[PDB]
């Protein structure tokens, strides 16, 4: 969150300033470059023609879009065209469905067989990532911190300060990132040793 | 089909200077953008270069960087060679037959088009 | 640099049976690349024998099948005739390389 590089920090369902008060039941750093224009398309519930055949997301989606213009590091001196694009598919992805593929698309009435052409498309093309490239069509460099908030015990925790238990007094507790206010005590109740 | 056939050959001295071309007779470059290829003598054909629509070639350092240059033109669906520092090894046939990049493309196994009938870079003194 | 090194000859009488090699490394026959040949005596077009790796190209007869695994490409001859008695090659990508990569050369053979 105090990083210098970051040029865009968007979150979702989580303060990026909270953050670090909170604890996840996983987290999955989706992680990737793109032409710097597309982090538009890089959003939930965005009609993304990229996000629906590279990086998806819910439309209902908790996480943070963490990403930095990587121009002076991956546009090499003599050129960069390293990565691709994925340009076509027959249908739109699931919300985080990765889907590698060597088919091609046939865009009318074209039979293609297996092999390229005019109407008979390949999913891929170059990223050009000149070092001159001007502003927004360089390489972008992405990670996709999202998070899972399940009921579930937590395991991913912010760097908290753990205090000393109080018991049989009124406390505002915090444990596992679950927190409210109450008497504590003490109880006979037989939790299984997985509850 | 997609009927390659290659032109423009030529003699010239040690460390001179060409230029080259090929065409697909009668059907448009656009879809099938053929890289440079030629024999090495005595031997089998030799990595020049491969292309794609958008720029992005690469040429091989074992013998053709910093001499070979690859480009075409669409009202003249022809590929070109603008060539400098002629090598003795560099004489033989020359043909322009696939098109798809070192990023996979076409398939993980390609197919090769057409295989015309060859042009040639030839060097003597 | 890296070559698919191929045999120099292999051999059969008319009508009968080779299977052949066509050798790289891991940094491309086993980098999921797959391979291809080319029949070519000087001064006649490259004949390409592959197609997908699952197919022959247009009107290239069933004695040209091949089988691509490891480290090797194999490519063959069933119902061998005097024309077979020529010059071919193979290629596929490398990954050690930037572009594409190629073979040793082959020699088909009627038998003597």
């Known amino acids: 969150y105090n990083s210098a590089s970051f040029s865009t920090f968007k979150c979702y369902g989580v303060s990026p300033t909270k953050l670090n008060d909170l604890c996840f039941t996983n987290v999955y750093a989706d992680s990737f470059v793109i032409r710097g224009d597309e982090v538009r398309q890089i959003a939930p519930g965005q009609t993304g023609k990229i996000a629906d055949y590279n990086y998806k997301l819910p439309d209902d989606f908790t996480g943070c879009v963490i990403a930095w213009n990587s121009n002076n590091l991956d546009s090499k001196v003599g050129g960069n065209y390293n990565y691709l694009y994925r340009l076509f598919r027959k249908s739109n992805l699931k919300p985080f469905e990765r889907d590698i593929s060597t088919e091609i698309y046939q865009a009318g009435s074209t039979p293609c067989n297996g092999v390229e052409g005019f109407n008979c498309y390949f999913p891929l093309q170059s990223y050009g990532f000149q070092p001159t490239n001007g502003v927004g069509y360089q390489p972008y460099r992405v990670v996709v911190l999202s998070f899972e908030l399940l009921h579930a015990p937590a395991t991913v925790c912010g760097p908290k300060k753990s205090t000393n238990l109080v018991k049989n007094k009124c406390v505002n507790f915090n444990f596992n990132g679950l927190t409210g206010t109450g008497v504590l005590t003490e109880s006979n109740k037989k939790f299984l040793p997985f509850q | 089909e997609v009927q390659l056939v290659e032109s423009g050959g030529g003699l010239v001295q040690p460390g001179g200077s060409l230029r080259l071309s090929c065409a697909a007779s009668?059907?448009?470059?656009?879809?099938?953008?053929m890289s440079w290829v030629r024999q090495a003598p005595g031997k089998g054909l030799e990595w020049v270069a491969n292309i794609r629509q958008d720029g992005s070639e690469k040429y091989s350092v074992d013998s053709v960087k910093g001499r070979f240059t690859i480009s075409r033109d669409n009202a003249k669906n022809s590929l070109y060679l603008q060539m400098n520092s002629l090598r003795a090894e560099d004489t033989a046939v020359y043909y322009c037959?696939?098109?798809?990049?070192?990023?996979?493309?076409?398939?993980?196994?390609?197919?090769?088009?057409?295989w015309g009938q060859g042009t040639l870079v030839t060097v003597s003194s | 640099q890296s070559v698919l090194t191929q045999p120099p000859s292999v051999s059969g009488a008319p009508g009968q049976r080779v299977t052949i090699s066509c050798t790289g490394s891991?940094?491309?026959?086993?980098?999921?690349?797959?391979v291809h040949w080319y029949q070519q005596l000087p001064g006649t077009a490259p004949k390409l024998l592959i197609y997908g790796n699952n197919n022959r190209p247009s009107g290239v007869p069933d004695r040209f099948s091949d089988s691509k695994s490891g480290t090797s490409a194999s490519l063959a001859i069933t119902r061998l005739q005097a024309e077979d008695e020529a010059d071919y090659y193979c290629q596929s990508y490398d990954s050690s390389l930037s572009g594409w990569v190629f073979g040793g050369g082959t020699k088909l053979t009627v038998l003597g």
């Open positions: 037959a696939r098109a798809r990049r070192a990023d996979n493309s076409g398939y993980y196994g390609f197919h090769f088009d057409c």
């Open positions: 891991s940094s491309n026959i086993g980098a999921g690349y797959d």
């Open positions: 009668g059907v448009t470059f656009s879809s099938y953008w």
